[PDB]
Design a protein around this nucleic acid. Structure first.
Length: 52
DNA sequence: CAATATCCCGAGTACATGCACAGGATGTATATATCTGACACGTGCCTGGAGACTAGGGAGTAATCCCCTTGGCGGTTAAAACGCGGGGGACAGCGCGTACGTGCGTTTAAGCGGTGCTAGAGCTGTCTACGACCAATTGAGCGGCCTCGGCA
């Protein structure tokens, strides 16, 4: 019980790391969506919404 | 008519294929399971219908010459065919990676309770952007003034 610190702010990102995990699991994916692979995927989505 | 070529038919030709075999891993088979979602029930919305009217557009025509279309153009190479060069083709082996097996232990999923992030709320509450209109500018064409070249 020490408050909470969202996975977005821990990563350094403005896109929602939690929401995207829960979207990847229950996509047409196989049965194991590692958590470090929702951070290298909020990033390589937010990067277009900068570069575009 | 002559000639190069494609077509056609039979001999002779390795191996490819279809098969039989051993055997192993998985498809079946039964019992159990909850829960997906089927189904049933209303909720409330928009999809649709249905009218009146302007004004924008659409259709039409008319005139016409631009552009396409055609013929005939003159100019130069891809094709034809040959000579001619080297290069794609067929064997000997090394060991390095790939696989595969072993035991490597990292992380996720789940179920837990707490809580703050977000996404529907407003007439929010305005005021960027949206017309509406004005004004400037350039460019083009038409008059008008003025030296000089070819003709009496």
């Amino acid at each position: 019980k020490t408050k909470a610190v969202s996975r977005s702010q821990r990563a350094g990102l403005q896109f929602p790391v939690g929401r995207i995990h829960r979207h990847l699991k229950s996509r047409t994916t196989s049965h194991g969506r590692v958590g470090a692979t929702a951070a290298v995927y909020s990033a390589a989505i937010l990067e277009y919404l900068t570069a575009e």
